[PDB]
Amino acid sequence: HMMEQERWNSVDVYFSSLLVKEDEALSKAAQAHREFDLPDLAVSAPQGKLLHLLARLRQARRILEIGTFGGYSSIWLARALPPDGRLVTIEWERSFAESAASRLAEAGVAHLVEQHVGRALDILPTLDRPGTAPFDMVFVDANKPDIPEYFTWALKLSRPGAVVVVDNVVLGGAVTDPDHPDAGVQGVRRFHEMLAGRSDVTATSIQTVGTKGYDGFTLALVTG
């Protein structure tokens, strides 16, 4: 009889089989973790499709991504863009970014993507310039301790109406513990506290299960 993760997988595989197609570029990007002996860090296919649909619903022309990894989420985001759009994506590990570059070329979207290699908090201030900012959508999916600062930068680099999605905000439930010693937990808590404390952005957080296990995301709308 199926174990719990097997049940979540079976439902995800079922929905995915009918709703989400992966071509060569996506199916290859989804295996980036195997090249680097890492756990699967990419959004699932249904999650990447959701990011794609959110960008298209927003009619996003400029998208900022913090955390390229192997380019899986990047392909979904770039494929939401119009021909004059741009995805700016940031990755700390050069080898990952180089792998992503190969996937984005295979995907036919290299002309839409501006990749940066380095620490996101070093790169983000360099993006506050005409032709790059303002972004219509920001996807935050890198290290968790810096989420508050990434959110601050998302606000500085975007505009009223912009959508900000922050991945992996559940941390196994540890986010409810004010005394938890992990900096990532405290960063996610600080971020939610920042959202509570201002009225020019409005948000919700959704817990999910599926092939990635139990986690969740935050969706914020900048209102001004």
| Segment 10 to 29, residues that bind ligand SAM, using CB under 6 A | none
Spatial CB neighbours of 97, under 8 Å, sequence gap ≥ 6: 68, 91, 115, 117
From 25, 26, 28, 67, residue interacting with ligand SAM (rule: CB under 6 A): 67
Nearest distance in Å: CB 200, ligand SAM: 26
Nearest distance in Å: CB 92, a second copy: 28
Spatial CB neighbours of 177, under 8 Å, sequence gap ≥ 6: 185
Query: Which residues contact a second copy by CB under 8 A?
Result: 2, 7-8, 10-12, 14-15, 17-20, 46-47, 49-50, 53-54, 56-58, 161, 163, 170, 173, 175-176, 192-193, 195-196, 202-210, 214, 216, 218-219, 221
Nearer to ligand SAM, 20 or 179 (CB): 20
Q: Rounded to whole angstroms, how far apart are CA atoms 219 and 15?
A: 22
Nearer to a second copy, 38 or 57 (CB): 57
Q: How many CB atoms lie within 10 A of CB 119?
A: 13
Nearest distance in Å: CB 173, a second copy: 4
Element containing residue 15 per DSSP (H, E): helix 4-19
| Segment 109 to 168, residues that bind ligand SAM, using CB under 6 A | 119-120, 141-143
Beta strand 113-117 with 86-91: parallel, antiparallel or unpaired?
parallel
The residue ranges that bind ligand SAM (CB under 6 A) are 41-43, 67, 69-70, 72-73, 90-93, 96, 119-120, 141-143
